[PDB]
């Protein structure tokens, strides 16, 4: 993530084997969710340090799009 001008670029997951081919991304409170076309899963992690990782669900096909429905 980074500022609107690209400054203060920071890493929330990096040099981690759990990413294979991530496609799309979603935020809610302090979680980040993303769809992986490699593992065919949608994941959950803490949006500041990636530290509390889990599988949301396993998909038969490649999960392409994701969004969080909330006001």
């Amino acid at each position: 993530f980074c500022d609107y001008d690209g400054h203060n670029r920071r890493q929330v997951i990096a040099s981690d084997l759990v990413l294979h081919h991530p496609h799309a991304l979603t935020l809610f409170e302090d979680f980040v969710y993303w769809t992986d076309r490699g593992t065919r899963q949608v994941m959950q992690a803490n949006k500041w340090h990636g530290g509390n990782q889990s599988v949301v669900m396993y998909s038969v096909h490649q999960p392409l799009g994701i969004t969080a429905i909330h006001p």
Partner: protein, 141 residues
């Protein structure tokens, strides 16, 4: 250990040993201590403030740094918790997570953190993009 690396430091009788806060003069020369939200300098000369807002995700929104502490606030859609760092959404409405597998839009009820899955729509063939409109409560794909 008698010729300790921390030896030949003046006792606290030497004008508080130059420490800016509470002071100790134990067997190993002398030691400067700092209150909560402070840290020692490199040369242990003075206490220095922690910039609690310079560590990402310490405070979930709008971190403000004070001389020895921090202040936090969250957007009108969020309410601060017991700890002055975390906030949650103010709504009674829970989040739902929607994902696009080839044949089906899948909805996940993040209700009671149980993750209860069900389909949104039946006729779908190959969904790629997903977004929603809060004004009309519709899902676009």
């Amino acid at each position: 250990t008698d010729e300790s690396p921390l030896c030949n430091q003046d006792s606290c009788s030497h004008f508080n040993g130059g420490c800016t806060h509470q002071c100790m003069q134990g067997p190993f020369g002398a030691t400067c201590l700092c209150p909560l939200g402070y840290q020692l300098a490199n040369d242990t000369k003075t206490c220095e403030d922690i910039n609690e807002c310079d560590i990402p995700g310490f405070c979930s929104q709008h971190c403000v740094n004070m001389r020895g502490s921090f202040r936090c606030a969250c957007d009108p859609e969020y309410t601060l918790e017991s700890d002055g760092r975390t906030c949650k959404v103010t709504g009674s409405e829970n989040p739902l997570l929607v994902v696009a597998s080839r044949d089906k839009i899948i909805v996940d009820n993040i209700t009671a953190h149980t993750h209860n899955l069900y389909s949104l729509v039946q006729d779908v063939s190959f969904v790629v993009a997903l977004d929603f409109d809060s004004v009309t409560g519709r899902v676009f794909w």
